[PDB]
Amino acid sequence: GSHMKKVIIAGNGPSLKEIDYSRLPNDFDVFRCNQFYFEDKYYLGKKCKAVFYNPSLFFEQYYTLKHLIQNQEYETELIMCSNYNQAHLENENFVKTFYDYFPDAHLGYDFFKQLKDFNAYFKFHEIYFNQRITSGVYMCAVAIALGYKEIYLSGIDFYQNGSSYAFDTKQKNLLKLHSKNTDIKALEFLEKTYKIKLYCLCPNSLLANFIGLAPNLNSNFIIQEKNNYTKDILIPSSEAYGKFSKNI
Amino acid sequence: GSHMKKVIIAGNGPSLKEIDYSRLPNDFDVFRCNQFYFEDKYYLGKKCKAVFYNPSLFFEQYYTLKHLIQNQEYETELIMCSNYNQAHLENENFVKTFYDYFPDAHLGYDFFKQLKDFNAYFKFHEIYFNQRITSGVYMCAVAIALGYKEIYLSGIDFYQNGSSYAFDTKQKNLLKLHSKNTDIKALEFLEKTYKIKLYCLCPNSLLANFIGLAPNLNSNFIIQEKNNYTKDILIPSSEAYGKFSKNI
Amino acid sequence: GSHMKKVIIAGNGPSLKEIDYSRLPNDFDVFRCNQFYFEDKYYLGKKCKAVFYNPSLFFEQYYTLKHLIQNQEYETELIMCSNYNQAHLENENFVKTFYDYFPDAHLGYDFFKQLKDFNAYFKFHEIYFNQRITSGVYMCAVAIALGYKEIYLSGIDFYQNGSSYAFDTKQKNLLKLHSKNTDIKALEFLEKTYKIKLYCLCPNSLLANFIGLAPNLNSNFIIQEKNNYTKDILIPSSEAYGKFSKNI
Amino acid sequence: GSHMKKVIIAGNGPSLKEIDYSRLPNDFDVFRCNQFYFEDKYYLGKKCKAVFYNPSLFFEQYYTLKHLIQNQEYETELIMCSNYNQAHLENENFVKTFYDYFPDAHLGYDFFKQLKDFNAYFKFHEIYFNQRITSGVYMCAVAIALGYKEIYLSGIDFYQNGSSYAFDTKQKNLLKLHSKNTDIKALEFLEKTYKIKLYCLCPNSLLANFIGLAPNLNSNFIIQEKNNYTKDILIPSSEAYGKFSKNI
Ligand SMILES: Nc1ccn([C@@H]2O[C@H](COP(=O)(O)O)[C@@H](O)[C@H]2O)c(=O)n1
Ligand SMILES: Nc1ccn([C@@H]2O[C@H](COP(=O)(O)O)[C@@H](O)[C@H]2O)c(=O)n1
Numbered sequence: 001g002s003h004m005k006k007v008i009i010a011g012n013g014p015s016l017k018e019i020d021y022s023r024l025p026n027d028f029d030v031f032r033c034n035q036f037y038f039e040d041k042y043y044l045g046k047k048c049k050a051v052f053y054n055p056s057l058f059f060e061q062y063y064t065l066k067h068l069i070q071n072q073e074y075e076t077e078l079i080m081c082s083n084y085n086q087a088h089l090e091n092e093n094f095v096k097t098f099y100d101y102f103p104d105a106h107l108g109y110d111f112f113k114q115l116k117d118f119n120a121y122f123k124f125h126e127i128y129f130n131q132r133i134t135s136g137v138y139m140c141a142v143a144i145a146l147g148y149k150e151i152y153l154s155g156i157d158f159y160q161n162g163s164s165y166a167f168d169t170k171q172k173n174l175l176k177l178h179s180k181n182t183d184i185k186a187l188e189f190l191e192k193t194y195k196i197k198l199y200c201l202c203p204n205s206l207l208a209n210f211i212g213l214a215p216n217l218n219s220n221f222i223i224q225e226k227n228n229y230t231k232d233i234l235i236p237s238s239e240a241y242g243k244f245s246k247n248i
Numbered sequence: 249g250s251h252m253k254k255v256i257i258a259g260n261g262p263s264l265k266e267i268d269y270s271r272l273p274n275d276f277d278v279f280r281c282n283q284f285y286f287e288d289k290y291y292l293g294k295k296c297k298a299v300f301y302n303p304s305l306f307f308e309q310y311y312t313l314k315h316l317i318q319n320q321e322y323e324t325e326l327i328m329c330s331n332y333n334q335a336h337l338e339n340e341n342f343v344k345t346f347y348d349y350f351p352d353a354h355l356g357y358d359f360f361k362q363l364k365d366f367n368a369y370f371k372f373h374e375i376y377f378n379q380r381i382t383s384g385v386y387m388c389a390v391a392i393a394l395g396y397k398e399i400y401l402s403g404i405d406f407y408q409n410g411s412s413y414a415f416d417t418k419q420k421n422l423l424k425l426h427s428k429n430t431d432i433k434a435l436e437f438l439e440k441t442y443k444i445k446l447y448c449l450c451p452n453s454l455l456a457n458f459i460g461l462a463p464n465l466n467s468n469f470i471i472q473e474k475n476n477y478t479k480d481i482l483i484p485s486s487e488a489y490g491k492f493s494k495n496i
Numbered sequence: 497g498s499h500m501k502k503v504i505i506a507g508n509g510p511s512l513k514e515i516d517y518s519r520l521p522n523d524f525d526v527f528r529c530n531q532f533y534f535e536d537k538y539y540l541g542k543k544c545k546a547v548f549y550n551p552s553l554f555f556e557q558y559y560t561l562k563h564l565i566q567n568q569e570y571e572t573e574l575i576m577c578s579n580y581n582q583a584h585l586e587n588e589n590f591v592k593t594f595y596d597y598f599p600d601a602h603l604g605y606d607f608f609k610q611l612k613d614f615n616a617y618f619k620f621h622e623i624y625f626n627q628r629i630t631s632g633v634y635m636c637a638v639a640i641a642l643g644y645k646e647i648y649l650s651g652i653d654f655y656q657n658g659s660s661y662a663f664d665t666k667q668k669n670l671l672k673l674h675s676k677n678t679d680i681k682a683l684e685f686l687e688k689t690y691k692i693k694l695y696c697l698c699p700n701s702l703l704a705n706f707i708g709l710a711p712n713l714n715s716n717f718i719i720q721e722k723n724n725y726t727k728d729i730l731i732p733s734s735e736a737y738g739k740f741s742k743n744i
Numbered sequence: 745g746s747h748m749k750k751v752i753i754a755g756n757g758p759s760l761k762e763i764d765y766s767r768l769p770n771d772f773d774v775f776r777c778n779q780f781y782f783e784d785k786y787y788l789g790k791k792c793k794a795v796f797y798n799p800s801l802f803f804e805q806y807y808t809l810k811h812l813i814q815n816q817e818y819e820t821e822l823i824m825c826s827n828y829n830q831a832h833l834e835n836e837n838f839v840k841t842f843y844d845y846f847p848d849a850h851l852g853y854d855f856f857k858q859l860k861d862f863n864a865y866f867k868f869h870e871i872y873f874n875q876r877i878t879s880g881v882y883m884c885a886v887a888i889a890l891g892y893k894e895i896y897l898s899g900i901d902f903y904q905n906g907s908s909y910a911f912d913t914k915q916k917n918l919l920k921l922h923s924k925n926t927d928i929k930a931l932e933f934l935e936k937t938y939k940i941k942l943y944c945l946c947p948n949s950l951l952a953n954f955i956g957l958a959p960n961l962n963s964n965f966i967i968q969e970k971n972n973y974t975k976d977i978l979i980p981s982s983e984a985y986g987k988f989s990k991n992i
């Protein structure tokens with residue numbers, strides 16, 4: 001973790017490409033999720049403090065991350081599975097044996113559950129109203145559970161249709177295998193309940209209509225272009241799948 | 249919890265409406281259970297320290313409590329499920345995943361089990377003689393496990409038939425989905441075993457024939473009337489039920 | 497428990513009636529097992545520090561003990577189930593939910609397992625050679641795990657046939673529902689491994705041929721006769737059995 | 745364990761018979777595995793700090809070890825099962841009840857899992873690439889988890905075919921019931937990650953081409969010949985198997 005430190009939570013919405021870099025803090029940790037590596041440029045750098053993946057694609061994402069790391073495209077300290085310990089959302093065996101199949105990773109819920117009131121908030125809305133927070137918000141909850149007090153948001157656009165993501169997701173392998181109000185109310189609850197501060201790094205995003213923009217500390221960050229980079233998720237061998245079958 | 253503090257345990261018997269308010273302590277926490285919100289007046293106020301619900305109706309009660317809270321009809325700090333960890337009394341999956349479905353609530357048994365001798369007392373009578381204590385007594389056991397030493401009882405009438413409850417329970421949704429000696433001996437065991445004091449707030453009740461009445465400290469409590477209040481339990485969506493199905 | 501204190505472990509062999517009372521320590525705790533209450537006299541008094549029962553009859557024994565206690569025939573501080581956590585010896589569900597059905601009792605194995613080497617000794621002989629220690633020895637292992645250093649043995653005769661027990665076991669309800677060397681080697685292992693001392697209180701028993709007799713401290717113990725005492729195990733209601741069915 | 749102390753990890757490759765005894769440290773603990781007792785001479789002495797056995801043959805190996813100990817052929821302090829907590833590699837029931845069937849033994853994984861990064865390294869290669877480390881490397885990981893900092897390797901030849909083992913394995917009972925690069929990279933990872941030192945005791949082995957030879961401290965070790973020794977694994981009774989059946 002990194003209590004006291006600043007963290008940038010990045011969703012993969014089109015606003016990820018519209019970061020106002022003059023509002024970027026001088027120092028920060030970076031939380032990325034799902035298909036972040038699909039980005040055509042290092043919008044937030046090669047170093048991540050943590051990467052999050054849904055349980056449904058964790059097996060393949062973990063495999064892909066190791067390739068990303070080995071190829072020196074990205075680095076990360078923590079690897080998180082964004083689970084909730086809910087029968088209708090995750091394979092039960094997957095969760096129970098998680099640390100034995102992915103020893104250097106964590107069950108996101110182990111941190112998420114430390115925020116008892118938000119866990120209740122999420123569970124009540126998901127279970128009774130079919131209202132679920134997105135990965136962007138999940139990461140904010142984990143960031144808070146880890147000790148962060150200043151969270152800078154980017155790439156959270158609430159699926160505006162105009163543009164689905166900050167990159168082309170029409171990838172062969174990936175293809176083979178929520179609302180604005182739900183997320184906003186959740187972030188509000190998080191800010192007011194645990195007394196942390198949320199900042200927005202993208203002035204053109206819808207998020208900017210609800211949370212204040214980060215100050216203009218102005219940093220000299222450099223955005224590096226990517227070349228011959230990995231832009232599709234990798235598929236493990238049939239043998240591998242056979243070994244992980246029990247965890248579906 | 250609230251060790252040292254005073255607590256009023258309220259059953260929903262007809263004596264709930266016959267509280268001798270001059271015997272009400274100047275300060276206290278309030279424990280309510282099941283259909284308490286059906287009351288036509290705030291006999292013990294809007295603020296509860298804890299509310300208890302049987303496992304069989306917890307799914308719907310939790311849903312209803314959130315509505316009660318959102319509508320500002322009641323407030324509570326703790327939400328308790330009055331379970332016993334008994335196969336013939338509760339769905340096993342319900343208990344095992346309880347904290348993951350209701351994060352801000354507690355399994356009453358986690359406190360009840362701290363009183364090893366009373367747990368034994370209850371288990372022996374329930375299992376071998378089919379003699380079960382009511383919710384009123386269960387709450388007394390939890391109150392003691394939480395540190396309370398002075399317990400004031402109300403709404404405990406041992407089902408006198410003359411009047412079943414302190415309100416009309418002939419509610420549409422509710423309809424859709426023990427003995428005097430058993431409770432009295434249990435309360436006696438509780439008082440003599442953990443050295444706490446039990447007081448009765450209703451002089452016209454049968455309970456008053458067994459436990460002493462609370463002193464006449466005389467307080468200036470105000471009983472507020474209710475209007476357009478929630479007086480029936482709410483039923484969650486079929487979608488919600490589908491998600492909670494495994495916990496029956 | 498009672499570390500430093502002296503304990504008398506009583507099997508139910510015929511030597512229970514041939515205790516040399518002049519060798520009885522001035523002060524002691526008493527461990528009894530199974531059908532001890534069948535005795536026609538209080539050979540070791542009415543007060544027991546602990547009573548042990550096999551898992552196969554625990555449901556009925558617990559029921560019977562409560563009757564013995566209520567009727568003031570015996571008193572006990574601890575109630576132990578002599579289990580081993582072995583699939584072929586005990587119902588698995590029985591062990592897993594034990595503390596929820598019998599809150600004031602203990603799983604003997606929770607103490608037995610603290611003696612890692614003896615647990616290994618027992619397991620190896622039971623599993624691979626079908627050589628099992630009797631309840632008398634099991635109790636010695638639990639006594640040691642509890643802190644006792646001086647153990648006095650009685651009623652351990654290794655089933656000499658001449659007389660099976662110190663009382664008539666031809667009881668209606670009971671009827672309805674190992675070797676010398678195995679026990680002796682186990683006691684030797686216990687004495688030499690945990691550095692405790694074993695004494696024999698019955699000079700006419702076979703046990704006296706292997707372990708030294710307790711010194712003649714000479715006490716003024718009084719053996720009280722029993723009258724209209726409980727001399728058969730009690731059978732719980734069909735309703736009770738229905739509730740405990742899952743634990744067979 | 746034995747932090748600070750030196751340990752000799754012995755595989756059973758043909759190099760076990762080609763130890764350069766002048767490079768043997770003056771004092772050390774010894775880790776042996778599987779069919780080590782098949783050796784025709786005490787190449788590393790009769791005293792072992794620990795012996796390791798795969799879960800598939802643990803039932804029979806444990807039985808055999810007890811015979812080896814009883815017959816005074818070997819002595820050991822620890823008995824380890826080299827497991828990984830992987831469904832496709834071990835019987836799940838075997839692992840869950842392990843400490844109840846073999847109280848004086850340990851699940852190797854309980855120590856192996858303390859090295860989170862190596863556990864991840866092993867799991868990733870095994871699961872996704874079908875690349876598994878041998879027992880020799882597993883023991884190195886356990887040695888490190890136990891506090892050892894200087895590890896001397898012997899009997900690790902990476903199955904050169906020329907000679908499969910340092911002894912004849914064509915044994916009746918045994919018969920009835922990986923790569924160089926995988927092991928070497930794993931040992932490298934271990935050395936560089938936990939900052940320990942690896943030494944090779946066999947100059948003629950392939951291992952000597954990758955890790956440095958131990959210094960010539962020169963000791964006066966004596967290699968004792970064996971006579972009428974146990975050279976085949978023992979088979980437990982059908983009764984025993986019947987009791988351990990659930991753990992396959
Ligand atoms: N148009 C978009 C697309 C992504 N996002 C967010 O970015 C995350 C993107 O990854 P996913 O769409 O794979 O979940 C979402 O969890 C959410 O927080 C957004 O807010 N608006
Ligand atoms: N007539 C009545 C009705 C309720 N009660 C008590 O009030 C509680 C009421 O809720 P229930 O009847 O829903 O359990 C009981 O658990 C018991 O303690 C009573 O003692 N006499």
Ligand SMILES: Nc1ccn([C@@H]2O[C@H](COP(=O)(O)O)[C@@H](O)[C@H]2O)c(=O)n1
Nearest residue numbers: 507508509630631632652653654655660
């Ligand atoms: N003849 C007898 C009978 C009982 N005993 C012992 O007394 C205990 C008696 O209870 P059970 O026969 O019910 O097990 C045995 O576990 C054993 O220690 C004995 O050693 N010789």
Ligand SMILES: Nc1ccn([C@@H]2O[C@H](COP(=O)(O)O)[C@@H](O)[C@H]2O)c(=O)n1
Nearest residue numbers: 755756757878879880900901902903908
């Ligand atoms: N030829 C051989 C044979 C054994 N070995 C090693 O010795 C161990 C031997 O026991 P197993 O072949 O039974 O596993 C292997 O786990 C491995 O570390 C080796 O490296 N080369």
